Amino acid sequence: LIYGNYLHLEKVLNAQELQSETKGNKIHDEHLFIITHQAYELWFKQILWELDSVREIFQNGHVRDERNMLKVVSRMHRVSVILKLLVQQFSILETMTALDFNDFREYLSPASGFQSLQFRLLENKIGVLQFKGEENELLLKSEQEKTLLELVEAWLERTPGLEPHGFNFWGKLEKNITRGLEEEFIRIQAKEESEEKEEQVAEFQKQKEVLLSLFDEKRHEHLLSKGERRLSYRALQGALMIYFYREEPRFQVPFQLLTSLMDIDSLMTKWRYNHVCMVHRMLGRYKVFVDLFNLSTYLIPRHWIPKMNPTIHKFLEH
Amino acid sequence: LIYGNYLHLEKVLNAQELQSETKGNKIHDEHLFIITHQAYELWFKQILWELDSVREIFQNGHVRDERNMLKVVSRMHRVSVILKLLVQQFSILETMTALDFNDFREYLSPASGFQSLQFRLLENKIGVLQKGEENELLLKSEQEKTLLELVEAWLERTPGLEPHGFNFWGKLEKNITRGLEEEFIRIQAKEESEEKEEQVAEFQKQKEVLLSLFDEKRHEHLLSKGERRLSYRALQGALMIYFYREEPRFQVPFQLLTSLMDIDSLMTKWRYNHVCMVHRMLGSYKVFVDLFNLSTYLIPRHWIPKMNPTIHKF
Amino acid sequence: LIYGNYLHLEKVLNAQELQSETKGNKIHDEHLFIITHQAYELWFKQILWELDSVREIFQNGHVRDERNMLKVVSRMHRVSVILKLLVQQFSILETMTALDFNDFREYLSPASGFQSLQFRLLENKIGVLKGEENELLLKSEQEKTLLELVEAWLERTPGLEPHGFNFWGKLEKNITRGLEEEFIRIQAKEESEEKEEQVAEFQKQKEVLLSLFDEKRHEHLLSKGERRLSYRALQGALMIYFYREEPRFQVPFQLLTSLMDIDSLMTKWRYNHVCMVHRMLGSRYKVFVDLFNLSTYLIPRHWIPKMNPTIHKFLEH
Amino acid sequence: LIYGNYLHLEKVLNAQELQSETKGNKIHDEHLFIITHQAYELWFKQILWELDSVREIFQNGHVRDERNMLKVVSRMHRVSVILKLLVQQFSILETMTALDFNDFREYLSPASGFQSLQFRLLENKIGVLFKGEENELLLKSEQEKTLLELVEAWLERTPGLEPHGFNFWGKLEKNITRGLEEEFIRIQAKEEKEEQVAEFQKQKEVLLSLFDEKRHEHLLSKGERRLSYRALQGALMIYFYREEPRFQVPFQLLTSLMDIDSLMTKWRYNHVCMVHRMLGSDRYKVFVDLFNLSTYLIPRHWIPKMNPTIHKFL
Ligand SMILES: Clc1cccc(N[C@@H](Cc2ccccc2)c2ccc(Cl)nc2)c1
C-alpha cells in the first residue's frame, strides 16, 4: 500500500478550515489552534482504542487467564506514554501569544470547558464521577457500559489469599497491626516523662487511629456513598494483598498494572491542570483510583506484614 | 462554532482503516501505526504552514522592514518546538514490540524509505540538496526559492560589509594575520622542548584553518562540489551577525541564525530516529552547514575588529 | 585540566550518605532520594547564577544600554530551559514506589515543606511575596528583586510621555470610543434572545476594559498584595505588548514573555512537589501576575493607537 | 536530619571552580559547563548504583528465585528513565552558543573524547567491547562479570530448551523448514512475481541462518555477536512465549536491556553532536543479539504450539 493512501491523508490533511480565512481575513496563528487540537483528538482515539481493548479483556473473562496480564499491563503503559506526550504538547500552544490568540478568538469564540467528545468518553470509560446529537448515543453507551474502575474492582475482589478459610490476609493483618501498635505503645510508655516522650505519645495516638481506620468497614462504606472512595471494601483488601506481596510471581505484573493505573490517573489530572492553565493564559484529588493512592500511603512497617506459608508461596507462583 | 465541527473531526477521526481488519484478521497494534504517522503528518502540515509563511516574508520583500523580524524569529522557533515534539513522538512507537509489528507487517508491507510527501516538501523548502497531482507540489518545491536561498540573499545585504564604510572582511583579515604573526613570534621564542613542538603543530593547524576563511577560491570550489551552500558574501554577512550579535540591529537576526541551526540538527535527529525505528522493526548534509562552520572558527575575542561610534549608532 | 579535577568530582561524587546504611540496614532506593535532590540543588545553583547576573545587569544600569538585551533575554531563556528539565526530573522519583519509600522514611523523617535554601533564595530573588545561611536568606529579602528591577525599567519605557505620543491617553480615548461604537451596534439589533445575551456580555467586558484606567483600583490591589507592578510599569508593559513588532520593543517583549514562562514553570515545579509529597506520604503566588493580566485584556487590534513617523524612527535601532 | 546536611550540600554546592575566574578573567557561561557535567556525574553514580545492584542479584544466585524479577526489571527500567533525562539534558548546553564557549575554552582546553570515569565504568559493566586510584576501579570493571555475561548465563538456563522435554529448537527448525517449503510451492505456482521469488530466496537464507550454529560460533569469535548459541535459544524462547506467565517479566527485562542499549547510543550520538557544535554511534551495541532475535521475521503460526504439560510448568 502507498503511504498517503494507507493513512488516508486525503481526509486527515484536508480537515483544516481556518474560520478567519472563511469569514474574511485569514489569521496565520489560527492554523496552530486547529492542528494542535486535531493532534490531541488523534491521540484520544488511540487512548480509547487501548482503553476499550483492556476494558474488553476484563469484561469477556480473559483477564482470568493470567497469560493476558502482559497484554493488559503493556497497553495501560502505552496509554500513560501517550498521555505523557499530550502533556508535553502544551509547549506547542505556548509558542502562540495571548495577544496573537485575540486576533482570531472572535472567529470561533472558544468556551473554556472540556468540549472534546473523545475526552469525555475517555473520562467515563476510566471511571470519572464528574449538547451533542448522535454523539449522545456514544456518550450514553460510555455511561451505561462497565468502567475500567468497575472491571478492575471486580477483578481485585478475586485476588488470591483473601479467603478467610485459607491464608485469611485481612485477619492476620489486623492481628499484626493491633499487636504491633500495642508493642509500640509499650516502647513509648517506657520512656522518661520528657517533652520528647509526650510528643511521641500524641504522634502514636494519631498514627494508631489511622492504622486501625483501615479495618473500619462501616467508615469505608460511608465514604464510598459520600463519593470520597470508589473501590469496594473487598477490592481494597485485594489491592493491598498485591501491594504487600508484589514480589510473589503471580502478583508481579498485577502490581505493575496497579502502579500504571495511578500513573494514568495523575497524568489525566496533569493534562486537565495544563488545560486550565492554557485557558487562563489565553482568556484569563477527585481521581478515579484514589483508593490505590490511599492504600499505598498506609505507612505499615515491613515486619508487620503477615509472613507467607510454603503452601501459599507455591500457589502464588506460575 | 462547535469543537468537533471546527476541527472537522468527521474526516480526522474517520480516516483509520486497519489493513489487517480489512484483509481478514484485525491486529490491534496496527491502529498505533496509523495514528502515529497521521499525527506526524498533522505536524508536518503545521511545519510547512510556518515555513512557507516565513519563506514568503523574505520573497515578498517584507523581511527588509526590520519590524517583521519578531514574526520571522518566533515562527522559526515554533518550527523547532514542533520538531522537538516529533522527535519525542518516537517513544510512542517504542511501546510496540518488533514481534507485535511483524503480526501486521505483511498487510501493508512497509518500505524503509521516507514515503512522506509533506516531509519531502519540507526538506526541499528548507534547502536539502537535489502520484500525479502530488508531483505538481513536489516539482513546485524544487523550483521555488528555498529558505536557504532566501536567507542567503538577505545575508548578502547585511550592513557593515561595504569596503568603503566599516570594511568588516578587510579589518578581520588584518587582525587575524597580525594576531597569528604575533603568536608565531611567541611560540618560536620557546626552548626545543616537547611542549614547544606541541604548540608549533597546534598553531600551524589553527593558522591553516583561520586563513582558509579568506580563500574565496577554495570556498567557490566547495560550493560547486556541494560541500558548502552559502555564497561567499553571505558567509561574510553571517559572520558579521555572529561577531556583532550584541548590537541591537543584529540581536534578532542572531536568534534567527541560531534557530536555523536548531531546526537543522532537529531535522537530522528526526531522520536518525526514523532509521533507528526502521531497524528496530525490520533489522534490514545539513542545509545550514555554513552557519555551523562560521560558529566554530575559533577566533579570539580581541582579534574581532572594534566598532566605530558612527557604526555603533547605525 | 583533568575532567574529574576540573569538576571537583572528589566532593560531588563523595557526598552520598545513606542514613539507612549508617544507622544499620541499608535501603537501596534511598540513594535515589539523595541523588535526585542533589541534582535539583546543582540546577538551583545554576539558576541562581543566571538570575543574579541578570539582576545585576539591571541594578548596575547596564540594562539601559540596549545592546545588553540579548544577554538578558538569553539568560532568562536558559532559566526556563533549566526549569523545564527540573519539572521532567520528577519522572525519576516516580520510579520509586511509595511502599519502597516507607522502608527508608524514618531514617531521615522528611518534612513536606520546601526545605531548600537555594529554592527559597530563588523565590525571594525573583520576587515571591539558620546561622550562616541566614545571612544569604536576609540578603535575598533586603536586596532588590527581579520584579522590582523590571518594574523600575518598565517605568522608563519610551512612548509613555504625555507630551510625546501619550500612549495611555490615546488608548483610553480609543477604548472609550470603541466601546461606545459597539454599544450603538448592539442596541441596533432586534429584541432577540441572542441580542440580550450580547447586551449582558458587552456590559461585563466594558467594566473590565475601563477597569484598566482605574488608577485608584490598581493602587488598592497593589497595597492588598493582589498586584505587584506599579501603575506606570503596567503602562510600560502594555506599551511593549501592543508595539512588540517595533524593533526597540522586540527583545523586551521576549523578556516579558520569558518572565511569564519562568513564573508558570516555577508554579508547575511547586505543583509537582506537592504531588510527589502526597504520593509518598499522603493527606496565584505568581510574581509577574500583572504581565499575565495585561496579556489577557482582550482589546481589539484596531483600537490600539496608530504609530506616527516621529515615534516609528524613535522606536527603531 | 536537616535537608542540606542529609544531602551534604557543603560538598555538592562548594565544588564549582571556574578556571577562567581562577586564572584571571571570569567567564559567566563557564559555570553552566561545570554544573551540566557535574549533574551528568551525579546521575552516572545513580545508574551505576542500580546497574551494580542488578549485576549482584544475578552473580549471587538471587535471580534464580523468580520473586526477585520485579526488583530486577524495575531497577533496569529506572536506568532507562534516568538515561532518558540525560539525553534531554543536552538541551541545557544547547543554550550556550559556540561563540560564548570559545571565550572560556582556552582555560580548560576540552578534549572531544569521553573523559568520564563513571561513564567508562558504566560501559564496561554493561558489556561494551585517567590514572592511579581510578585505574583500580577501571581494572575491576573489566575483570568482573558484565551484565551481558550474567544475562547470557541466565538465558542458557531458560526452561523449555531441553531436547527431551518440549525441544524448542527442534520444533522451531521443523516448522520453519516446512513453512518455507510450503511458501516456495505457493510462489513457484505463479507465472515468471519475480520480485517475490528473489525476496523469498533472500528471506529463506536469513531464516535458516538462525540454525547455523557454526556461522554463529564464527561471528561470536569475530566479535560480531556477543551471546552464546544456547543463550540465543533461551532469549528466543522468552520472545516467542512472552505471553506465558513465567516469561512475562523476563520479556520485560530483555526489552528493557535493548532500551538501555539504544539510550546509551543516543546519549553518545548527542555527545558527538555537542562536541562538533562547540569545536570543529553505530551498531556496536552490547545486546546486538537481542535486537537480532527480535527482527527474525518468523510468522506467528510457525511458532511451535504449547502442550498442557509445558503450559502448567511455565
Ligand atoms: Cl479547537 C477548539 C474549538 C473551540 C473551543 C476550544 N477550546 C479549547 C480551550 C481553549 C480556549 C481558549 C484558548 C485555548 C484553549 C479546548 C481544548 C481542549 C478541550 Cl478538551 N476543550 C476545549 C478549542
Ligand SMILES: Clc1cccc(N[C@@H](Cc2ccccc2)c2ccc(Cl)nc2)c1
Ligand atoms: Cl504509515 C506507513 C505506511 C507504509 C510505510 C511506512 N514506513 C515508515 C517506516 C517504518 C517502517 C517499518 C517500521 C516502522 C517504520 C515511514 C515513516 C515515516 C516516513 Cl516519512 N516514511 C515511512 C509507514
Ligand SMILES: Clc1cccc(N[C@@H](Cc2ccccc2)c2ccc(Cl)nc2)c1
Ligand atoms: Cl533530601 C530531603 C531531605 C529531607 C526532606 C525532604 N523533603 C522533600 C519532599 C518530599 C518528602 C517526602 C517524599 C518526597 C519528597 C523536599 C524536596 C524538595 C524541597 Cl525544596 N524540599 C523538600 C528531602
Ligand SMILES: Clc1cccc(N[C@@H](Cc2ccccc2)c2ccc(Cl)nc2)c1
Ligand atoms: Cl567538564 C569537561 C572538562 C573537560 C572536557 C570536557 N569535554 C566534554 C565534551 C565537550 C567538549 C567541548 C564542548 C562541549 C563538550 C565531555 C563531556 C562528557 C564526557 Cl563523558 N566527556 C567529555 C568536559
Ligand SMILES: C[C@](N)(Cc1c[nH]c2ccccc12)C(=O)O
Ligand atoms: C484467576 C484470577 N485471574 C485470579 C486473580 C484475580 N485478580 C488477581 C490479582 C492478582 C493475581 C491473581 C488474580 C481470577 O480470579 O480472575
Ligand SMILES: C[C@](N)(Cc1c[nH]c2ccccc12)C(=O)O
Ligand atoms: C534592510 C535590511 N533588512 C538589512 C539587513 C539584511 N540582512 C540583515 C541582517 C541583520 C540586520 C539587517 C539586515 C535588508 O537589506 O533587507
Ligand SMILES: C[C@](N)(Cc1c[nH]c2ccccc12)C(=O)O
Ligand atoms: C534606555 C532604556 N533601555 C529605555 C527603556 C526603558 N524601558 C524600556 C523598554 C523597552 C525598550 C526600551 C526601554 C532605559 O531607560 O533603560
Ligand SMILES: C[C@](N)(Cc1c[nH]c2ccccc12)C(=O)O
Ligand atoms: C530458576 C531460574 N530462574 C529459571 C530461569 C532461567 N532463565 C529464565 C528465564 C525465564 C524464566 C525462568 C528462567 C534459573 O534457572 O535461574
